[PDB]
Amino acid sequence: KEWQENKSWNAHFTEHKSQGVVVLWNENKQQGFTNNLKRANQAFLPASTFKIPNSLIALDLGVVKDEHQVFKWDGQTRDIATWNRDHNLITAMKYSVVPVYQEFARQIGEARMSKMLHAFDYGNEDISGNVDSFWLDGGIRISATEQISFLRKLYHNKLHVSERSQRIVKQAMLTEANGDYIIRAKTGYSTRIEPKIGWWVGWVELDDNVWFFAMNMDMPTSDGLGLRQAITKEVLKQEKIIP
Amino acid sequence: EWQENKSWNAHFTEHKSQGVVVLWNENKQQGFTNNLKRANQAFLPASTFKIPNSLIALDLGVVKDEHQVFKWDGQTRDIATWNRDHNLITAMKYSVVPVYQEFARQIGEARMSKMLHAFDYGNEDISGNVDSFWLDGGIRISATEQISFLRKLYHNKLHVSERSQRIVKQAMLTEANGDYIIRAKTGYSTRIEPKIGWWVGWVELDDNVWFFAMNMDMPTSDGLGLRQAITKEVLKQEKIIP
Numbered sequence: 001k002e003w004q005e006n007k008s009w010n011a012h013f014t015e016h017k018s019q020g021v022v023v024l025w026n027e028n029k030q031q032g033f034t035n036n037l038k039r040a041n042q043a044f045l046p047a048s049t050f051k052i053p054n055s056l057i058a059l060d061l062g063v064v065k066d067e068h069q070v071f072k073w074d075g076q077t078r079d080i081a082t083w084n085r086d087h088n089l090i091t092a093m094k095y096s097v098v099p100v101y102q103e104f105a106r107q108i109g110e111a112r113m114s115k116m117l118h119a120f121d122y123g124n125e126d127i128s129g130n131v132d133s134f135w136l137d138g139g140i141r142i143s144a145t146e147q148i149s150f151l152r153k154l155y156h157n158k159l160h161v162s163e164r165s166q167r168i169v170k171q172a173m174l175t176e177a178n179g180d181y182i183i184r185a186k187t188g189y190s191t192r193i194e195p196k197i198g199w200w201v202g203w204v205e206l207d208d209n210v211w212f213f214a215m216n217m218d219m220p221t222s223d224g225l226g227l228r229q230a231i232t233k234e235v236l237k238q239e240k241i242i243p
Numbered sequence: 244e245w246q247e248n249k250s251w252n253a254h255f256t257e258h259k260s261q262g263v264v265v266l267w268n269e270n271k272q273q274g275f276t277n278n279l280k281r282a283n284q285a286f287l288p289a290s291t292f293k294i295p296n297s298l299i300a301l302d303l304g305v306v307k308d309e310h311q312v313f314k315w316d317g318q319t320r321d322i323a324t325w326n327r328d329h330n331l332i333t334a335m336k337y338s339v340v341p342v343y344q345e346f347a348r349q350i351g352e353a354r355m356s357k358m359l360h361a362f363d364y365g366n367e368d369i370s371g372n373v374d375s376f377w378l379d380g381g382i383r384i385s386a387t388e389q390i391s392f393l394r395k396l397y398h399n400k401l402h403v404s405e406r407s408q409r410i411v412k413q414a415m416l417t418e419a420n421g422d423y424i425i426r427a428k429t430g431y432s433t434r435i436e437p438k439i440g441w442w443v444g445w446v447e448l449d450d451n452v453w454f455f456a457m458n459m460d461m462p463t464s465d466g467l468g469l470r471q472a473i474t475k476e477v478l479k480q481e482k483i484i485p
């Protein structure tokens with residue numbers, strides 16, 4: 001059976017006084033699992049998880065030459081200290097540097113952004129709003145299941161951009177690696193339209209399988225942001241995917 | 244420029260051990276070592292040779308990509324992890340010699356010799372069995388020459404495709420967290436004296452990369468854990484990793 005509900009995972013949200021969904025996909029078995037089939041299919045603003053398609057499009061169009069090209073700080077002091085400094089693609093992804101990605105989106109422009117999101121079958125494919133903010137307060141929406149379908153295409157180099165573009169973005173997604181697993185992922189935090197939600201989307205590479213994941217959770221304040229990873233890892237540990 | 248830091252000898256002494264750690268600061272273009280003579284001593288690369296071997300195999304099409312499966316030949320060997328199917332990523336991780344011996348046989352002596360010349364790799368001498376020269380043949384490379392080769396790989400400057408270089412750097416991934424990424428390969432030269440352990444690679448930080456190459460005397464497999472442990476003690480002392 002393709003999609004299966006595991007209500008036992010709700011204990012991981014309950015135990016943190018949280019509400020959300022975790023979706024897993026077993027690539028070898030071509031089967032998916034979720035605590036909440038309805039919420040797995042509800043669409044939300046992608047917020048910073050949009051850095052994955054934005055990175056791909058920027059590299060494929062040559063807006064970003066490679067993962068070492070330096071994007072100079074514009075000398076405007078912002079809220080997040082790690083943003084007030086020079087970045088390359090690796091560090092801009094790591095510190096989720098919005099102003100770097102805003103400039104990419106402006107250089108890409110509305111016409112190319114729209115065509116590439118259709119080509120990617122990415123969420124509702126709707127870029128209505130400002131070209132440098134639609135993933136934060138515009139028309140674009142994506143579900144946890146639609147994140148999985150996009151990431152599977154990236155993993156297999158099946159997106160309609162160069163293999164090189166896809167390999168570079170997967171490098172930039174690297175989050176954790178040890179002798180047991182590799183996680184390639186991207187966090188997000190949608191705050192401008194209700195409900196406020198946190199995301200964590202990506203995959204776990206094991207020796208002989210890959211488990212795709214997409215989670216979102218209600219995030220009324222920034223206090224709970226560490227639960228995006230903590231809850232996903234509690235589910236991965238339950239299912240014996242990581243130790 | 245090069246500098247000797249004898250204080251790192253303490254990390255070797257404490258584990259009753261002899262060897263060398265070489266570090267290269269890419270931003271400053273400066274090298275550091277506990278032993279300048281040993282930094283330039285050339286040894287058999289043993290399993291560290293999997294780095295150039297993978298590059299050549301990918302560039303020639305002997306390996307199509309990092310997913311291609313190399314089926315176990317059915318010969319039961321001493322290392323349990325070798326007695327199973329592998330791809331490039333797991334073959335590097337478990338250092339599966341028989342997979343790399345088959346690559347070498349398909350590359351062949353002529354293309355292997357030419358490619359090591361193009362890479363400026365060590366003494367560029369493949370004398371011996373085409374499928375064992377890096378374990379018991381004539382090839383020799385120093386810790387400083389390992390760093391030279393790795394800097395070219397890091398910058399995509401080796402004369403193979405960018406794609407081959409990106410795949411091998413993916414396969415080298417050893418560790419990553421919010422502080423650092425290590426891309427590296429271990430080795431153990433067991434067949435020709437002196438028996439030594441290797442660890443070569445680099446640490447990626449937000450705004451610098453530190454290349455490293457270490458080797459140490461390894462009279463038995465009991466001290467293999469020290470290859471990483473002594474290197475990490477030097478990286479901590481130098482405030483490169485927490």
Ligand SMILES: *C(=O)N1C[C@H](NOS(=O)(=O)O)CC[C@H]1C(N)=O
Pocket residue numbers: 046047048049095096097098136186187188189190191
């Ligand atoms: C992305 O969702 N954003 C940028 C930055 N990212 O941190 S996250 O990756 O930990 O979610 C701050 C939150 C958010 C934004 N406010 O634009």
Ligand SMILES: *C(=O)N1C[C@H](NOS(=O)(=O)O)CC[C@H]1C(N)=O
Pocket residue numbers: 288289290291337338339340378429430431432433
């Ligand atoms: C490579 O040097 N070798 C293959 C294998 N890997 O050990 S490693 O951890 O040093 O990579 C065993 C040692 C050695 C060999 N015996 O050929």
Ligand SMILES: [Cl-]
Pocket residue numbers: 047048049050051097098101
């Ligand atoms: Cl963003």
Ligand SMILES: [Cl-]
Pocket residue numbers: 170171174412413416
């Ligand atoms: Cl990687």
Ligand SMILES: [Cl-]
Pocket residue numbers: 289290292293339340343
């Ligand atoms: Cl080998």
Ligand SMILES: [Cl-]
Pocket residue numbers: 163164167405406409
């Ligand atoms: Cl490439």
